[PDB]
Design a protein around this ligand. Structure first.
Ligand SMILES: [Zn+2]
Lengths: 76, 49, 166, 58, 44, 86, 122, 58, 232
DNA sequence: CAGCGGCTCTAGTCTGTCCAGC
DNA sequence: TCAGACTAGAGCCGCTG
RNA sequence: GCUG
């Protein structure tokens, strides 16, 4: 819980990138997409509704780790 | 290959590499400089290396 | 039969993300370790339980989910002290072939130890007389890959007497 | 030539989750980045994060 | 010297084709599957 | 091209060779002792056993090994016939 | 796929049979033709395996019997492998225990062997 | 910035004398960490700075 | 030219293009005009799934010669590629399965990398949303000339099409122009107004300017294009 | 009275000198 | 072409015994 | 050699 509450730009880019690849590979979409044919556009819509099934594991330099849910982290 | 006559393609130099590091773009640097150039597989023996 | 604790890195492809993991790993691990003898271990059959399933990574490539899975699977491995009951699915002149019922027709008994009326003379004579019992005697498995079977057994038949059938 | 040399030397440094700057081998260069932990691209003032006179008027 | 080289560094990651630790490589993602770890065991 | 034919030779034969089993008569005495002590050094107390076999065996059971005139008189003489150093 | 623990045997025939009977009837609930182009070796082993265990009349064999027979077995001093043989072999008559049964030498006594026939019959 | 430094002149450290390297050769001198450089300059503050008669002694 | 620098540190890449650049102020600052001749060549592998099956069918039907179209089709567990110039494409569209890969042409809204050849800082390479237009040059709004140090005097610039969904996201979120309005160095804006956008704004905002209702409306109505088309 | 040793000094040598296109 | 900061040498004198 |  020591690590920053705000999601970093690097974290957002990877979460969207993995989610888009998962959606492009026929994963379930939780946003009821309306007229979207591009996986990256669908992934960004999921992040806005805070419904992405991914947990970010933040590894401290010593080797200890803390897991933050994508929904829990504040998105700027 | 090297150029327009040979339908060569374009170079990601040592300076463009330095730009992409400063963005923290680890997967794009892997896509550009491995996957879309010279991706390969080797058999490695874990005993003798 | 014996339990064998095993550890595997089981990859669930991302179109199975509806189903629960511990079921959808089990559907994969049955397709990984059924009818396959593991060298120095025995003939795996199916999945007993998944004793510990740890956290589902997702790697920079595939986009799939790779959970390292500790489990227990039941395997077939006679303990060198078992009197089994099989069926003669074949008779060769060097020795009889017994088969456990629809289990594996790969148990090949050598025959030198039963009562001194022993020969198989190629007209399918079982034994010159005085379900079929078997004593599994040695473990013997050969790793197949060699260049750019595999659990065979040797099976005995001592002076059991065999009161019901000769 | 200068740019090649500087980048080769400094490419590794990364700001860590424990608010430290470490090399790849795990040695410390700085215990907190730049003394403040703050990002040069976010400075609304002359090397300072805010300008209070402007913010209160807004 | 028989030196062994840690493939951890940025430049050798680009040479070997593995994703660099800095940036988006510093953390790992877990899938939030509906799973039950340490599930009920079959009694012997 | 003069040698570009095959591996030089499977083996190179030296026209002169070893003399014999040299010192033939007397090493019958040492030669049996070569095999005598090796029969007794292996069957000695000063050896080790493969306890990794027994930790490998989960089949332990009963009835197997895995489960299971000096005619002399007293005297005492302690000589320092030897060195008085180190 | 490294096997961490090579062995751990207490799986009596009934246990494995029962697991297989629940498994066979449970796999078909979700039986899939998508995975047919992939794997089908599992079906064959389970199917045929059920029959060999079925040979032993574990049909009508009960879960409680495992403890009930075991409670009698601990007094006899036979080893765990021996008892598994005793349950799995299910010696129908004295001759198998009298002769076929393991560790006949010394421990037979013509006393507990006779008692075992009453226990095995139970 | 090294590509923006046109190797300008009109620089004399404020003393109409004492020419200095500046621009890219000065950055190059710093980051090389060479043990000797062109025109090394020590600035000495005088304690009794009141008048020129004390400066010319020291 | 040695392996360390020539073949390892910097290497030639595919799905890349180069052309003369020329201005276009009617594009947004995050957009770049890509000519049809480059767009028909630079393909992106779109994986077939429930959201795009009916869209990719129409692209497969158009085929290689019409711009919203496709050059190759690849079956689920196969690695050879069917060149879609031959065969009957209306049959190959019907036999699309989930998990097939359609190598569609570059279309509007693709994330595309855009780069001047000498790079002194990170803003010399940025990601832009492609829009296809007929003329041969690459075109972008002149507010983005200052990061690239471009001057439209026969200048050439490079284009790279990231071939992976993960490479789109890292390009779009981290390297997008809207995320890079300020230089990392001193934190000052580099994408801003330039000549004829400063002079026109200066002369407009001088005190001597007065407009009647007809000329007020005709200057303001210029902004009513694109996403501002719906606003009052 | 003689011998290490470091200093000190020649000078010797190998090592670089932007990105890319045609 | 222009250093350039390494690597041995040749000493040197003077204490160091 | 020239363009970038
Ligand atoms: Zn090897």
């Amino acid at each position: 819980r020591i690590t920053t509450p705000y999601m970093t730009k690097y974290e957002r880019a990877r979460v969207l990138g993995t989610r888009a690849l998962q959606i492009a590979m026929c994963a379930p979409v939780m946003v009821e997409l309306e007229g979207e044919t591009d996986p990256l556009l669908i992934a960004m819509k999921e992040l806005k509704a805070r419904k992405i099934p991914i947990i970010i594991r933040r590894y401290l330099p010593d080797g200890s780790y803390e897991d933050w849910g994508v929904d829990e982290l504040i998105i700027t | 290959t090297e150029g327009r006559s040979r339908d060569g393609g374009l170079r990601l130099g040592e300076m463009e590499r330095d730009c992409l590091i400063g963005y923290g773009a680890s997967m794009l640097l892997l896509e550009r400089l491995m996957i879309s150039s010279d991706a390969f597989e080797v058999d490695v023996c874990g005993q003798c290396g | 039969f014996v339990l064998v604790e095993m550890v595997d890195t089981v990859r669930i492809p991302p179109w199975q993300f509806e189903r629960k993991l511990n079921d959808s790993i089990a559907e994969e691990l049955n397709k990984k370790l059924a009818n396959k003898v593991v060298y120095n271990v025995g003939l795996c059959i199916c999945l007993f339980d998944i004793t510990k399933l740890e956290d589902a990574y997702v790697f920079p490539g595939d986009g799939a989910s790779h959970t390292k899975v500790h489990f227990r699977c039941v395997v077939f491995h006679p303990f060198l002290d078992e009197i089994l009951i099989g069926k003669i699915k074949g008779c060769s002149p060097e020795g009889v072939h017994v088969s456990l019922g629809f289990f594996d027709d790969i148990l090949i008994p050598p025959e030198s130890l039963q009562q001194p009326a022993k020969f198989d003379e190629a007209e399918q004579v079982w034994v010159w007389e005085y379900g079929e019992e078997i004593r599994f005697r040695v473990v013997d498995e050969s790793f197949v890959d060699t260049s750019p079977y595999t659990l065979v057994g040797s099976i005995s038949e001592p002076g059991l007497g065999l009161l019901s059938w000769w | 030539y200068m740019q090649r040399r500087l980048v080769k030397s400094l490419e590794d440094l990364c700001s860590q989750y424990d608010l430290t700057v470490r090399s790849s081998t795990g040695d410390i260069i700085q215990f907190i980045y730049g003394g403040d932990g703050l990002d040069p691209a976010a400075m609304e003032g002359k090397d300072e994060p805010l300008e209070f006179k402007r913010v209160l008027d807004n | 010297f028989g030196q062994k080289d840690s493939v951890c560094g940025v430049s050798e990651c680009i040479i070997m084709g593995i994703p660099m630790n800095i940036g988006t490589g510093l953390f790992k993602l877990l899938h939030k599957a509906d799973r039950d770890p340490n599930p009920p065991k079959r009694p012997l | 091209f003069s040698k570009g034919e095959k591996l030089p030779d499977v083996v190179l034969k030296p026209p002169p060779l070893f003399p014999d089993t040299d010192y033939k008569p007397v090493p019958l005495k040492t030669g049996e002792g070569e095999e005598y002590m090796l029969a007794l050094k292996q069957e000695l107390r000063e050896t080790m056993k493969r306890m990794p076999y027994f930790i490998e065996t989960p089949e332990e059971r009963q009835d197997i090994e895995r489960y299971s005139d000096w005619r002399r008189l007293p005297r005492e003489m302690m000589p320092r016939n030897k060195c008085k150093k180190a | 796929m490294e096997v961490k623990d090579a062995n751990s045997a207490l799986l009596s025939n009934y246990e494995v049979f029962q697991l297989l009977t629940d498994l066979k009837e449970q796999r078909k609930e979700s039986g899939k033709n998508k995975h047919s182009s992939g794997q089908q070796n599992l079906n064959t082993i389970t199917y045929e395996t059920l029959k060999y265990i079925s040979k032993t009349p574990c049909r009508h064999q009960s879960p409680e019997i495992v403890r009930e027979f075991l409670t009698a077995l601990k007094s006899h001093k036979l080893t765990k492998a021996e008892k598994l043989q005793l349950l799995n072999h299910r010696p129908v008559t004295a001759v198998e225990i009298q002769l076929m049964v393991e560790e006949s030498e010394e421990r037979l006594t013509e006393e507990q062997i006779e008692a075992l026939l009453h226990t095995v019959t139970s | 910035p090294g590509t923006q430094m046109t190797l300008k002149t009109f620089h004399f450290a404020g003393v109409a004398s004492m020419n200095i390297t500046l621009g890219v050769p000065r950055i190059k001198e710093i980051i090389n960490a060479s043990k000797a450089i062109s025109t090394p300059i020590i600035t000495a503050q005088l304690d009794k700075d009141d008048d020129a008669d004390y400066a010319r002694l020291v | 030219q040695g392996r360390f620098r020539g073949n390892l540190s910097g290497k030639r890449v595919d799905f890349s293009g180069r052309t003369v650049i020329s201005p276009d102020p009617n594009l947004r600052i995050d957009e770049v005009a890509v000519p049809v001749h480059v767009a028909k060549i630079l393909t992106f592998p779109e994986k077939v799934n429930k959201a795009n099956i009916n869209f990719l069918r129409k692209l497969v039907q158009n085929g290689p010669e019409v711009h919203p179209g496709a050059n190759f089709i690849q079956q689920r567990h196969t690695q050879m590629k069917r060149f879609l110039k031959y065969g009957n494409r209306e049959k190959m569209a019907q036999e699309l399965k989930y998990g097939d890969i359609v190598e569609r042409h570059l279309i509007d809204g693709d994330v595309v990398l855009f780069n001047r050849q000498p790079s002194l800082h990170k803003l010399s390479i940025m990601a832009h949303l492609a829009r296809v237009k007929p003329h041969r040059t690459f075109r972008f709004n002149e507010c983005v000339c200052t990061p690239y140090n471009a001057d439209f005097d026969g200048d050439e610039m490079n284009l790279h099409l990231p071939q992976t969904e993960e490479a789109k996201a890292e390009a779009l979120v981290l390297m997008g122009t809207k995320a890079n309005l300020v230089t990392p160095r001193n934190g000052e804006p580099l994408i801003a107004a330039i000549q004829d956008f400063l002079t026109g704004a200066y002369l407009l905002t001088l005190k001597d300017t007065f407009f009647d209702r007809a000329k007020a409306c005709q200057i303001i109505a210029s902004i009513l294009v694109g996403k501002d088309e719906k606003i009052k």
